[PDB]
Enzyme design. Structure first.
Site, PDB file in Angstrom:
ATOM      1  N   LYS B 219       3.611  15.088   3.020  1.00 50.48           N
ATOM      2  CA  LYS B 219       4.986  14.659   2.928  1.00 50.48           C
ATOM      3  C   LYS B 219       5.792  15.554   2.018  1.00 50.48           C
ATOM      4  CE  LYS B 219       5.419  10.382   5.007  1.00 50.48           C
ATOM      5  NZ  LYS B 219       6.719  10.924   5.505  1.00 50.48           N
ATOM      6  N   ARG B 253      -4.181   7.750   5.279  1.00 47.77           N
ATOM      7  CA  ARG B 253      -3.749   8.221   6.593  1.00 47.77           C
ATOM      8  C   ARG B 253      -3.385   9.674   6.461  1.00 47.77           C
ATOM      9  NH1 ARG B 253       1.300   9.051   9.242  1.00 47.77           N
ATOM     10  NH2 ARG B 253       1.154   8.622  11.472  1.00 47.77           N
TER      11      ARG B 253
END
Ligand SMILES: FC(F)(F)c1ccc(/C=N/Cc2ccc(C(F)(F)F)cc2)cc1
Lengths: 273, 273
Positions: B219, B253
């Site tokens: 991210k 994840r």
């Protein structure tokens, strides 16, 4: 947290702004010489430059007596090998240098030759005079936990006791609190299961009130967990660095500087260091 | 700690033995077709096989409506794309499958086609009927923290409130406690500084009493810290996974399954999971 900086002669290390990365330099000895050769010293210098470029704050230099090799070699021979490395690296890489030795005479030479910090895997117990050397030159000394057996009653409580015995040897010799650093000696005198337990409880070393250096890079217990050989230990080293930083460690001593340095920086941002 | 296992039809996930790795599969859509083509589905299958081989416990499948793309695309079109992937992957990879959608109708189809878990980035707030779908098929649902603004009074307290509103939507619709998983939605509706703060305080989500899935892979906030582009985010992702596991997370994840899976395993050994 730390109301002082670590004073390393020409260099100064801040203990609050970030986890400090100590880059591991092992000598690659030339066969055919007792040290100081071009191939040997240039390989050492080139590696120190790479680690400096990759984010290392300290270059840690070891001759043959120390880890990983443990050769039975004299202080006369060790000096002809280790001193030329320190002279060249100190001249050519603007970083503090630590000498990874337990030997008082080697420590002395290494500092005369330009080393700034002493890194003792025997915690001043193999050669107590090393603390006197430390006291005299007024340099930082890293006291690592170690002993000649694995007969522990209570791992952590014994580690802290054992470390405190090193603190007392160091302080009796004149070493100031500000020049003491501790290291839990992960991978030494511990079973794999004890290495894991030490990592799980690292934050306990903080009550002794000294900066903590963690040295888990590529060690065997990571292999035991992952069933992976030494050259595939990056992720596992990573984990240990991250957990160490979360548990308050000020330094980590690593081979893979690029990678560990990035993980350290991200951990620091997350925990607010 | 967990006095139940996560029931996923033919598969069962234990929540105590190890951190569970959810491998991210994004569709690579064929131009020239609305889905089901050989190149598209075979690329999806091949990738699921690699992640299974690299240690993934769950394969997470996303069409075009969901992250990272967010395309404005109908449920009719999304089904022709996402269903063929689920049919082939479920047939050819012996792993539970989650459908990364916030859309009730897509979730329904995906499960009919063989998906086992629902992964909703809107926490059942974009389409509440998704909780009814979840309740009916009796599958696990992942409620991620999200909202349409960054106007927080007290980040963590608001996250927990917001999440609890999702828990209430899910429970009112008939979802059992045992099929609820939470996710802090790092990288959503948060400034970089708020993402770091959420990571620093993740352990607070545990008081809600549900398993927690962490999704920080690659991210943007990792880039903000390291000043590094998406393809160089391995170390920073690593840090976040490690810190998450230390803070009690049950799942992570991730895109880089090989690496993150090794870090997870080492963390587990250290913290005693
Ligand atoms: C780039 N690929 C090599 C590599 C593998 C693992 C890591 C990790 F960050 F340590 F996980 C960093 C880099």
């Amino acid at each position: 947290k730390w109301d002082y900086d670590l004073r390393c002669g020409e260099y100064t290390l801040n203990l609050n702004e970030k986890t400090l990365i100590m880059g591991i330099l092992n000598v690659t000895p030339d066969s055919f010489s007792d040290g100081g050769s071009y191939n040997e010293v240039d390989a050492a210098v080139r590696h120190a430059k790479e680690m400096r470029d990759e984010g290392a704050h300290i270059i840690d230099i070891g001759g043959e007596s120390t880890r990983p090799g443990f050769a039975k070699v004299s202080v006369e021979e060790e000096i002809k090998r280790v001193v030329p490395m320190i002279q060249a690296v100190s001249k050519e890489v603007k970083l503090p240098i630590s000498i990874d030795t337990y030997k008082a005479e080697v420590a002395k030479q290494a500092i005369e030759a330009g080393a700034h910090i002493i890194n003792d895997i025997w915690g001043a117990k193999a050669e107590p005079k090393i603390a006197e050397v430390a006291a005299h030159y007024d340099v930082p000394i890293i006291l690592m936990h170690n002993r000649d057996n694995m007969n522990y009653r209570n791992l952590m409580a014994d580690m802290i006791a054992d470390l405190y015995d090193s603190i007392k040897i160091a302080k009796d010799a004149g070493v100031r609190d500000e020049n003491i650093i501790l290291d839990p000696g992960i991978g030494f005198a511990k079973t794999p299961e004890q290495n894991l337990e030490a990592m799980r409880n690292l934050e306990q070393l903080n009550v002794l009130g000294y900066p903590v250096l963690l040295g888990t890079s590529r060690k065997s217990f990571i292999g035991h967990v992952l069933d992976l050989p030494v050259e595939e230990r990056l992720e596992g080293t990573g984990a240990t660095v991250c957990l160490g930083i979360e548990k308050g460690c000020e330094f980590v001593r690593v081979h893979d500087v690029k990678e560990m340095s990035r993980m350290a920086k991200m951990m620091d941002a997350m925990i607010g260091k």
